Amino acid sequence: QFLRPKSLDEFIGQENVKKKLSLALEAAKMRGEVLDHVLLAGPPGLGKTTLAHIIASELQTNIHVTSGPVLVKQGDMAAILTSLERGDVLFIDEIHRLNKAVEELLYSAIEDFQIDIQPFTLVGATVRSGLLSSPLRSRFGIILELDFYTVKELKEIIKRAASLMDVEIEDAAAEMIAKRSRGTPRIAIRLTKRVRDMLTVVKADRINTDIVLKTMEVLNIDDEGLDEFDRKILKTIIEIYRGGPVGLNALAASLGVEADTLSEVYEPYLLQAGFLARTPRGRIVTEKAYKHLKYEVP
Ligand SMILES: Nc1ncnc2c1ncn2[C@@H]1O[C@H](COP(=O)(O)OP(=O)(O)O)[C@@H](O)[C@H]1O
Fold first, then answer.
1. What residues bind ATP, as annotated?
2. 8 Å CB contact between 176 and 40
3. How far apart are CA 216 and CA 133, in angstroms?
4. Measured in angstroms, how far is the CA atom of residue 221 from the centroid of ligand 1?
5. How many domains does the chain have?
């Protein structure tokens, strides 16, 4: 966790998110009040969990980490709720996955802090806020939508990670990794770790473009940052479904993966980067996809 930002000042990018959260956070600390409930939404690896921890640290309260799919029976939820101290942060990742039982219980503690529960701050995280129910969603006073990071922001994150790992890196090299990070800090840091391994084995003084290219070849990451499965999704649509449109369920079954993982984990970046598009009849690949994967444009 040595690479995990401990405060907003150490959290690169997400300017709109930071200013909104900072405003609410500072104000609450100044008044000694419990912070309004916060919902963090965006694809994986963007910093939702990191922001949840930062919120508690800034408030100087304790954070209770839990997972929606974990809270099965009301007993589990009720127990966690009663363990909360005034001002504590209850962090629920994949909160939209809470069953009606534990959800209705949680909702109750939000209306009047009684199911007596100590006033606390509910911080939920989900890949997409739309997955939450109408009731629970309207209970969040602050909703922070995180989008993919820019290449410039990612480069900054990469240089920071390199420094923390005691390794020198050239700007052009950091740029190359960032361009292949699929707009995600998690990916950018893992790629940096792997590039570090290559520097180690080739005994270099610092990471350059050559070292990065060698690493990307070993990792099978192309010039667009797409990995094996990313290409597998596009190739399946192209070859089996003639480019689409293909329904999410049909596509997921052909790939042997859950539909949720496909649409919530991999599709986001592919849509953002213009390789995929969604239509009422289903997903389709774009001309950019065909060209990039060197498939004859039908
Ligand atoms: N803005 C950022 N600056 C630096 N590192 C970041 C940032 N956002 C995320 N990370 C890093 O990426 C990893 C992924 O973050 P995490 O908060 O777990 O993502 P999420 O909960 O959205 O899946 C963490 O290692 C973290 O320390």
1. 10-12, 46-47, 111-113, 139, 185
2. no
3. 41
4. 21
5. 3
